[PDB]
């Protein structure tokens, strides 16, 4: 199987790798259209970041950013994912009939589970060692993190299914980078063992490594020179059977996947 | 095993990807020093190109370009390879005591074999469908090219060994891109089957794909946007056990190899 590409379109001011570049509505639409041209299957819209240096974005402001971009992309028939962890914003996305809701908190509020069940959109259920809120910088034990993540998925999937969410709507994301720990060994272990998530839960898995900190620690590179380590980790994940890849440089990943497919 | 990196330093005017950038002596030395900083094990110096659009460079001019660069790099203890197919230039490299002579013609002139035997430098024996001269654009049958290449290596190795060249000095390069054919299928087959060269001859193999045309035909990219397809093919070759990789972007390849090593 070939991994599907989520194209990151950050409509923020403080995204760790491209904050402020696509804050304007038309520039965000133009960026999304370019990523689709580059081979993106889904456009992941994020009007609020979640890196350790992020600043809280209000719900009204977040919906204001997403509203005209969703409208323009839905007009073109583009599959839309929204990277939001705020239940009121997620409820707005259900009304807009987007294809995915991408929650770094993994839908931890059962009060809205009945509303999620009535929708038909797919749910990207992400695990993090923080569980609630944006990423932080904390050292973790890789084996213990993988074990707790496996238990977290099992309980959260069961809670959503018990509330009426169809199981096949759930896509699992183990988290990566600071969502797993400040030491890169935890991210490395998850990258090596994520097929065990597909096997245990029989659900698709998304891998999101693009430009993240742990790549820079292994190679000694800042965020602007992280294309090569990103591509190395993304094609490792593709070769290992990742169902979705969430990336910034869609064109480079697509070209790299075309070469890997021709050689494999 | 980890592939060794040959850093390309073109002291030419018409190299297909970076011609004219490092024609100046000090700029070529500065580029070579940067590539060593980026992780290059060997610096491959080429004062004359061999792409299909190349222009013949005189022997006197070629030696004039290489002479001060070799001197500066030898002062720093840098391992030097010289990409030259002219016997008089190769004789100059033997006098300079460089570590490698990289011949796209695979040393086809037995008149100089006795001189090659007395030297201690390693010999990069490259195969091409043209055999003599620079690359051309010609469509070829992949299976027939691989078969003829295997026979070419067998006869050329035996001729060099019979003349006194120690067998362990020979590094095999199957050729790539236009050296194999204008259709990318021939390059793809050689990339998939080059371990058979190591097995049959018990010699090291060099893979040189960086920015070459066949990558652009598979992905639909010009020479300036070929980093991602280059990295995809280079780490495929590394994972398959290539002993040497000849590349332009040493820093990107090194960073990519560090990630692949940490994940493998
Ligand atoms: C930087 C971020 C923001 N949103 C994400 N969303 C998902 N699903 N996975 C990530 O790793 C992730 N990284
Ligand atoms: C573009 C070039 C010039 N010199 C080379 N040298 C070797 N050994 N192999 C190549 O593929 C090669 N490509
Ligand atoms: N949202 C996130 C953005 C970046 C990182 C990281 O660099 O590890 C983690 C989370
Ligand atoms: N010397 C060479 C340079 C480039 C190519 C190629 O693009 O195929 C082939 C030979
Ligand atoms: Cl960007
Ligand atoms: Cl709701
Ligand atoms: Cl800590
Ligand atoms: Cl739960
Ligand atoms: Cl850097
Ligand atoms: Cl360059
Ligand atoms: Cl000689
Ligand atoms: Cl032809
Ligand atoms: Cl011969
Ligand atoms: Cl292009
Ligand atoms: Mg974001
Ligand atoms: Mg050259």
Numbering used by the authors:
A (entry chain A), B (entry chain A): 0 to 263
What did the published study say regarding this structure?
The Sul3·DHP+·Mg2+·pABA complex structure also featured a well-defined active site. This Sul complex structure contained electron density corresponding to DHP+21, pABA, Mg2+ and PPi. Multiple electron density features verify this trapped molecule is DHP+, including a clear break between its C9 position and the p-amino group of pABA, and a ring pucker around atoms C6, C7 and N8 consistent with saturation at the C7 position. The position of DHP+ in the Sul3·DHP+·pABA·Mg2+·PPi complex superimposed with its position in the YpDHPS transition state complex structure 21 and the pterin ring in the Sul2·7,8-DHP·Mg2+·PPi complex. All the protein-ligand interactions observed in the Sul2·7,8-DHP·Mg2+·PPi complex were consistent with those observed in the Sul3·DHP+·pABA·Mg2+·PPi complex, including the hydrophobic interaction between pABA and Phe177. Furthermore, the conserved Phe residue belonging to this helix (Phe178 in Sul1, Phe179 in Sul2, Phe177 in Sul3) and providing an additional hydrogen bond to pABA through its backbone amide nitrogen is lacking in DHPS enzymes. The sidechain of this residue in the Sul enzyme structures was localized near the carboxylic acid group of pABA and occupied a spatial location that would clash with the sulfonamide group and its N-acylation (i.e., the azole group of SMX) as revealed in the YpDHPS·DHPP·SMX complex structure.
The sulfonamides (sulfas) are the oldest class of antibacterial drugs and inhibit the bacterial dihydropteroate synthase (DHPS, encoded by folP), through chemical mimicry of its co-substrate p-aminobenzoic acid (pABA). Resistance to sulfa drugs is mediated either by mutations in folP or acquisition of sul genes, which code for sulfa-insensitive, divergent DHPS enzymes. DHPS catalyzes the condensation of para-aminobenzoic acid (pABA) and 6-hydroxymethyl-7,8-dihydropterin pyrophosphate (DHPP), producing 7,8-dihydropteroic acid (7,8-DHP); this compound is further transformed, ultimately leading to tetrahydrofolate, an essential precursor for DNA and RNA synthesis. All three Sul enzymes adopted the (ɑ/β)8 TIM barrel fold also shared by DHPS.
